[PDB]
Amino acid sequence: RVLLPPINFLFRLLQQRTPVQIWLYEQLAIRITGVIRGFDEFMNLVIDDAVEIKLSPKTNEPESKRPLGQILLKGDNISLIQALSGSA
Amino acid sequence: MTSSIGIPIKLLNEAQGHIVTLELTTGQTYRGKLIEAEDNMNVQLKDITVTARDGRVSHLEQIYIRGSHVRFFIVPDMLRNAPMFRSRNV
Amino acid sequence: ANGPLSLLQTAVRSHTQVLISVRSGRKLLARVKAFDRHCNMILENVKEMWTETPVTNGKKGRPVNKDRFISKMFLRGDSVVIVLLS
Amino acid sequence: PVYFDRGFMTDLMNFPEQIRNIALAGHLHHGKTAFMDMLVLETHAIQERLDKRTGKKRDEQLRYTDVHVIERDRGLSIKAAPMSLVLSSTKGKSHLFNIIDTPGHVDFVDEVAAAFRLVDGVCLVVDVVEGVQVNTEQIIKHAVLEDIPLTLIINKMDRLILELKIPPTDAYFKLKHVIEEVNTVIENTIPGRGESKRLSPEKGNVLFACTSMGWCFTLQSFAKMYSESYGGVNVEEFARRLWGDVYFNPKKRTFTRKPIEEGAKRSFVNFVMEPIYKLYSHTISEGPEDLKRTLSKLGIFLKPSQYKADPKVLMKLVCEQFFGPSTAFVDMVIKHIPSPLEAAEKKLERYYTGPLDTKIAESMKNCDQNGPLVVHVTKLFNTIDAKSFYAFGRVMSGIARPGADVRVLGEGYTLDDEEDMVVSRISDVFIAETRYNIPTDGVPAGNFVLLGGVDNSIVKTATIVDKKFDNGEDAYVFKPL
Amino acid sequence: KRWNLTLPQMANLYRLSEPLVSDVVDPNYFYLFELKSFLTAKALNVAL
Amino acid sequence: YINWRMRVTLNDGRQMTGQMLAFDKHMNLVLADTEEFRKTKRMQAKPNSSTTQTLIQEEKRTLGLTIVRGANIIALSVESPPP
Amino acid sequence: MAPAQPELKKYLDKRLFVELNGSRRVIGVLRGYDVFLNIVLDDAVEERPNGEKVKLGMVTIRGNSVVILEPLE
Amino acid sequence: TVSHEDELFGKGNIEEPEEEAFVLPAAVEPFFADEELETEDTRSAIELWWAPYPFDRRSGRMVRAQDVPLIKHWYLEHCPPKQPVKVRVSYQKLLKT
Amino acid sequence: VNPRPFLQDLVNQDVIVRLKWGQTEYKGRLVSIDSYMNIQLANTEEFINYKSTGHLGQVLIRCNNVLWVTAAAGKQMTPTE
Amino acid sequence: MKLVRFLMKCANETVTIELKNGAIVHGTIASVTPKMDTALRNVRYTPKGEEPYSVESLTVRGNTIRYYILPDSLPLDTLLIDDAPKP
Ligand SMILES: Nc1nc2c(ncn2[C@@H]2O[C@H](COP(=O)(O)OP(=O)(O)OP(=O)(O)O)[C@@H](O)[C@H]2O)c(=O)[nH]1
Ligand SMILES: [Mg+2]
Numbered sequence A: 001r002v003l004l005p006p007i008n009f010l011f012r013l014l015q016q017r018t019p020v021q022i023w024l025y026e027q028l029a030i031r032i033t034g035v036i037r038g039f040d041e042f043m044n045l046v047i048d049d050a051v052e053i054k055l056s057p058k059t060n061e062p063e064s065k066r067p068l069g070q071i072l073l074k075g076d077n078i079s080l081i082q083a084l085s086g087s088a
Numbered sequence B: 001m002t003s004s005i006g007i008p009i010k011l012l013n014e015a016q017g018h019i020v021t022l023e024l025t026t027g028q029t030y031r032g033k034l035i036e037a038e039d040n041m042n043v044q045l046k047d048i049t050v051t052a053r054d055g056r057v058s059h060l061e062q063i064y065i066r067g068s069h070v071r072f073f074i075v076p077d078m079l080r081n082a083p084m085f086r087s088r089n090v
Numbered sequence C: 001a002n003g004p005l006s007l008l009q010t011a012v013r014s015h016t017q018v019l020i021s022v023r024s025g026r027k028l029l030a031r032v033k034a035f036d037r038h039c040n041m042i043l044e045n046v047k048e049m050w051t052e053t054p055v056t057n058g059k060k061g062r063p064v065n066k067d068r069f070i071s072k073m074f075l076r077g078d079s080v081v082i083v084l085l086s
Numbered sequence D: 001p002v003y004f005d006r007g008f009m010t011d012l013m014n015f016p017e018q019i020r021n022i023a024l025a026g027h028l029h030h031g032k033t034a035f036m037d038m039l040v041l042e043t044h045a046i047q048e049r050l051d052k053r054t055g056k057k058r059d060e061q062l063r064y065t066d067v068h069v070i071e072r073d074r075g076l077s078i079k080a081a082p083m084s085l086v087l088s089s090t091k092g093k094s095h096l097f098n099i100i101d102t103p104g105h106v107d108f109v110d111e112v113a114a115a116f117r118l119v120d121g122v123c124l125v126v127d128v129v130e131g132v133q134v135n136t137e138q139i140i141k142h143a144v145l146e147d148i149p150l151t152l153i154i155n156k157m158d159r160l161i162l163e164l165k166i167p168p169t170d171a172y173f174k175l176k177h178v179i180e181e182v183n184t185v186i187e188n189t190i191p192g193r194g195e196s197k198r199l200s201p202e203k204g205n206v207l208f209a210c211t212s213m214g215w216c217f218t219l220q221s222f223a224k225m226y227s228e229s230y231g232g233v234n235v236e237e238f239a240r241r242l243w244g245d246v247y248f249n250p251k252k253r254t255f256t257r258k259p260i261e262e263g264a265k266r267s268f269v270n271f272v273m274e275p276i277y278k279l280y281s282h283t284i285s286e287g288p289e290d291l292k293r294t295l296s297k298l299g300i301f302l303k304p305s306q307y308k309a310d311p312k313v314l315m316k317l318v319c320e321q322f323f324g325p326s327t328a329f330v331d332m333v334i335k336h337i338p339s340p341l342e343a344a345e346k347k348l349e350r351y352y353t354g355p356l357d358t359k360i361a362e363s364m365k366n367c368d369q370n371g372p373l374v375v376h377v378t379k380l381f382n383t384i385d386a387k388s389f390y391a392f393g394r395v396m397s398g399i400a401r402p403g404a405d406v407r408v409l410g411e412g413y414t415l416d417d418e419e420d421m422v423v424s425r426i427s428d429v430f431i432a433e434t435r436y437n438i439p440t441d442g443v444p445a446g447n448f449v450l451l452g453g454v455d456n457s458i459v460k461t462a463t464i465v466d467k468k469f470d471n472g473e474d475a476y477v478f479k480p481l
Numbered sequence E: 001k002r003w004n005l006t007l008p009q010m011a012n013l014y015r016l017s018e019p020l021v022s023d024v025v026d027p028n029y030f031y032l033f034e035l036k037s038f039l040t041a042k043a044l045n046v047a048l
Numbered sequence F: 001y002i003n004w005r006m007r008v009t010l011n012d013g014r015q016m017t018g019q020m021l022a023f024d025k026h027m028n029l030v031l032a033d034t035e036e037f038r039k040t041k042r043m044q045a046k047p048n049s050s051t052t053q054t055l056i057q058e059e060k061r062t063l064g065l066t067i068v069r070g071a072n073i074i075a076l077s078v079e080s081p082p083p
Numbered sequence G: 001m002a003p004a005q006p007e008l009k010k011y012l013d014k015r016l017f018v019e020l021n022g023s024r025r026v027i028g029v030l031r032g033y034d035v036f037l038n039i040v041l042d043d044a045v046e047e048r049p050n051g052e053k054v055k056l057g058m059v060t061i062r063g064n065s066v067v068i069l070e071p072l073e
Numbered sequence H: 001t002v003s004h005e006d007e008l009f010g011k012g013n014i015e016e017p018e019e020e021a022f023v024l025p026a027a028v029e030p031f032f033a034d035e036e037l038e039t040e041d042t043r044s045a046i047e048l049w050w051a052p053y054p055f056d057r058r059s060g061r062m063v064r065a066q067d068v069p070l071i072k073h074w075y076l077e078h079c080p081p082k083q084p085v086k087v088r089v090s091y092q093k094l095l096k097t
Numbered sequence I: 001v002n003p004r005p006f007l008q009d010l011v012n013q014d015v016i017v018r019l020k021w022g023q024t025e026y027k028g029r030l031v032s033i034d035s036y037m038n039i040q041l042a043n044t045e046e047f048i049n050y051k052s053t054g055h056l057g058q059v060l061i062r063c064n065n066v067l068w069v070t071a072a073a074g075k076q077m078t079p080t081e
Numbered sequence J: 001m002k003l004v005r006f007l008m009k010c011a012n013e014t015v016t017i018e019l020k021n022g023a024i025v026h027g028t029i030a031s032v033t034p035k036m037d038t039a040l041r042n043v044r045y046t047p048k049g050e051e052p053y054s055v056e057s058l059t060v061r062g063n064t065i066r067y068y069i070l071p072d073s074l075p076l077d078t079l080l081i082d083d084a085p086k087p
Helices: A006-016 B007-014 B077-081 C006-014 D006-012 D032-043 D055-059 D069-074 D106-118 D134-145 D158-162 D168-189 D219-230 D235-240 D267-285 D288-296 D311-322 D327-336 D340-351 D359-365 E007-016 E035-043 H042-049 H072-076 H085-096 I003-008 J004-009
Strands: A019-024 A027-038 A045-055 A062-073 A078-083 B019-024 B029-037 B043-045 B063-065 B070-075 C017-022 C027-034 C041-052 C064-075 C080-085 D019-026 D081-088 D094-101 D121-127 D150-155 D206-210 D215-217 D247-249 D254-256 D374-382 D389-397 D404-409 D421-426 D429-432 D437-440 D447-452 D462-466 E002-004 F005-010 F015-023 F029-045 F052-068 F073-080 G015-020 G024-032 G039-047 G053-061 G066-071 H059-061 I014-019 I024-033 I039-048 I051-061 I066-071 J014-019 J024-032 J038-046 J053-060 J065-069
Touching (some): A006 G039, A006 G053, A019 A045, A045 I003, A062 I003, A078 G024, B007 B029, B007 B070, B007 F029, B019 B043, B077 F052, C006 C027, C006 C080, C027 C064, D006 D081, D006 D094, D019 D032, D019 D134, D019 D447, D032 D081, D032 D094, D032 D121, D032 D150, D081 D327, D081 D429, D081 D447, D094 D447, D106 D134, D106 D374, D121 D168, D121 D327, D134 D150, D150 D168, D150 D327, D158 D168, D215 D311, D215 D327, D219 D235, D219 D327, D247 D267, D267 D311, D359 D374, D359 D389, D374 D447, D389 D429, D389 D462, F015 F052, G015 G039, J014 J038, J024 J053
Parallel strands (some): D019 D121, D150 D206
Antiparallel strands (some): A019 A027, A027 A045, A045 A062, A062 I066, B019 B070, B029 B043, B043 B063, B063 G066, B070 F052, C017 C027, C017 C080, C027 C041, C041 C064, C064 J065, D206 D215, D247 D254, D374 D462, D389 D447, D404 D421, D404 D462, D429 D437, D429 D447, E002 H059, F005 F073, F073 J053, G015 G024, G015 G066, G024 G039, G039 G053, I014 I066, I024 I039, I039 I051, J014 J065, J038 J053
16 A cells, blocks of 8 residues: 555645646635646745636535636635546 | 643543533534544444434444534533543642 | 735835735734735724724614724734725 | 553443453473563552662562572572453453463472463463473463463573674574474474464564563564654554564665665564664673763653662663663454453363353353353462462452352362362452552452452362352352363 | 762763672573572571 | 642533643643533513523533543633532 | 653454544554654545545545544454 | 564565654654763773672772781682692692691 | 746736735736745736735735735636636 | 734733633733733633622733723833844
8 A cells, every 4th residue: 555645645636737626715615726737835826827616505506607717726725626537 | 822722622531532522503412432532523333323403313333523614512421520620739 | 025915015115004904804003014925914003994883772874984094003914805095 | 560550440441342361371480480570560659669679689580479488598489470451452452361370390390380270361471592492391381282372582682782792684684493393393293283283473473572671573573663763664564573484685775585786684683683782782891981972863852860779770771761661562462362351261161170152151251241250260360478368360250259158179070079069258359469569349350359268178179150040050160270 | 868860970880899899790690699598597407 | 739629611512620630741731620601691471570681500410530631721710629 | 851652552453433623434444653642544434424434545544633532343 | 474574674675764764852762872882991991890809899898917918819810730749739728727 | 837937037027916815817028036936026917806905015924814916918717708 | 923922912901801701801911922812810700691709910812802992191212223133
């Protein structure tokens, strides 16, 4: 068994350029979709091609799309980071 | 200045193996056998009968609870007489 | 000196009025007497205003902006939403 | 005066999860009573009255559990010796240890056998110089054949520094030789099954101690104090990398099988034995100022009048500052020796003559505090005036209480023959500390008890049960020693 | 009334005392030649 | 001020009173023979009076030996000297 | 003193249940952790109060969002 | 059946596997790594450790000059071999005293 | 791109401050930044709920009250449909 | 410069304390900790809309405070001198 550090996972995302989905901190309907550009020891996320997704309050489907681009997201607001596996 | 473990965390380390009841700030109450404890109040428990304010009575086995999300433990009375509460004369 | 907090030093060096929005939903207007790296500030000539909706006989009334004058102020850092140097 | 609360210790008996019943056994003059002395001096405030002592008498070993006048005059133990102590682990949890100090002379091994009936585990104390001796072989063979769990305490480590005066690599080879001698005797007792019952320092069931200077450690506790002194160190991995043919490469910082780096030392020699050798050498070899700076470089600080003390007293103070208390011994016994529940199941399987599917056997298997009283008495201790005896045994069910109506059952008692049975009366319950007796009104199941007034019918061993079992059930006897 | 001495001083004093200092290190040297055995032999009217 | 009998205000407005035994740098309190005191603002409407009586009713609980975290403490108040 | 690694050694290669703030649930086999307990999992499924399943793949979860762990086995 | 060394590396690896590859923190040092194993006063220290009383001490109380028996251990020890009868009798009479 | 050089490259250029509550954004020029990445920013003008609320001036923004900060090079902040 | 030392210098002053949850405290300062917690005497405490009560002492822990109102006669400029040693 080999351990996987979360910083190693972030580095793997950075070198693979896999897009990620970020939930906001107890904003259950608000997410950010984008390809990772950089991170630090405080996991502050420099994100590229990022779009803001607002979910419906009744059934949690994406309601609005807000393209935003390159963002330094604060490390204190990440709830979960999903590695969006593209259909290759 | 070595980081001395506080007397409350020492009492929590004494409380492992006993039956403790934890009240969280996220609303859950657990009654269970404290298996594992840390210096930053992360606790692993076994028996955990569950009781919340909305009445979520349930029973299950094994849990890890982080120390930031908890309010307070209740520990057995006999742990009051632990050796840490007697003043070592220096 | 060279960081953002230097504007508070500029507030110290000029004694100008500063509008502070706090996490309680209130607003402050005061002259900066002292500050630190931790953004804990001491203020003088302080006028603090806020907005409240009085509920009269179970009916939500119109929002009213009221205020209070405080001579000496010790405002603590983390509750501040934002600082405006006017 | 003790450093714990006796009421807290009586509270600790009502918990057969964290209790350990162990016997200290070994060859003659290998350091069992000195290990008990270390534990007593950790738990009792008696060092003040030992320092009011002059002449050759202040150079005497304390020998707390040697109380017979024969024991005092001959300088060796002739009787088994029980104590109950509150000892703390590394994490800070206090446990109750019920420890029997057995004699080490061969002629008195029957006392050892009596202790081996009552304990959950055996700590075998082996002197590092003499190694395994004939009584060590006898104790190993008996404890293995009776399926008693076994731990190893290598004693008298200071001799390797102060008597043999051998370099630390040769001290490692001497330690490994003694450990493999113990494992060789264990394997020779049961051929093919010695891998399950194997003592090795990387397994955590081997303790290195010097009981004259009152210190002990495992590899886990020594890696733990490295982690405390530095931080970021994983204790269990560093501990399992501190024994064997494992060499540390300091520029590569890597543990290998061979010294791939020039001048690399063995990991146990590099990290453990050379610090202890240098601690001894610099403590006994340096003046007060040089020793003060040397000990201050490791955070060790003595009182200013203690740096000019005699070298043995100074060495003891420096050792107790460096190694600390006996938490490593507590960790070893907690991890490698079972609670009275598991050992109670094994004990009822091995030495009980009645059926195991009955209710009283379920009370004895679960160490039930609220069940009917069953005590297995294997020892008799004379009083101060030697008019009568106290019966020392193990409460395995119920609570031993003063003023209790009981049936003492001899070795010849059966169902068809009730000839060897006497109805008697328990008068006072004691916790035995072998120099004082704590008067108690109750001792729960799975614990050691010293009863008065039930001695007359006991010849060698006995089974003390209640006058009547509330389910209407017959009683049986334990097997003889 | 009280003295304390360093290691070189005690070593020098021990080296200067070698005409009149004991060379016995093992107490086992005094087996059956000590006060207790002398008193026991006195009690039994025997001589070691 | 060790062992002085004290009352503690909790984050959710509850009270935690009893015999304190210990505290640390993070203001976490070991508190013996603890009584938890809870207040609820009940609207006790009498069948004869149309005005619903606003009363902050008081309810009790016993816990014994407790250990409260300093991240949820608000204020520390004196209850009584030790008996 | 730096924070020690949390005692997650028993939970390697185990399907676990994670209760997160906002009453979110994440069910997945453990992959690894750090000294802060940011937790990386494989085969992650998100669960909402309505009771449906969302496929995620292998993900990471912030430590301050982590509230409760629970072994399924 | 399996060794401690052929559990840490693997049969004849003579190296930790690089997938696990445990490494100590760079700050971690042996407890007295800079200090020498011995000192020029260490042979004398061990020699004085085994010296008879009072030479194994380094502090004490002062005694009367007549309270120091300089030759008492001569007759508290076994007599040398091949003495005259008068010397042996003197040894035994000092023992008697 | 590491975060500290990323915000060092956005000094004295058009920046959006997406705050953390109240649906508030600020448009202006990022003047100065510390190791705690607090914000001193000039020529601030403030939008709430994607509608204009007005110009303020020289503003200190504490980083804990902020969702994030981005570059505003040709980016429109009206709610897209 | 740390403002905890200025909290040390303004002891024995009758102040008003506004908390992060909303309660109001008032009375004369007994002492203040280096971790900006403060114990105060001659205390009156008003919760959210219910009846205030007075206690002889109250040790309020400082992570839940919003701000203070000091007495207007406090010589702030005299307390502004730096008595801490220069490193
Ligand atoms: N060098 C050295 N000597 C020790 C040490 N511990 C004990 N001794 C000596 O070894 C002798 C052991 O005597 P005991 O304490 O009775 O040993 P025991 O294991 O109880 O053996 P029994 O008398 O048969 O029960 C004592 O005279 C001590 O002076 C030690 O750690 N180092
Ligand atoms: Mg003995």
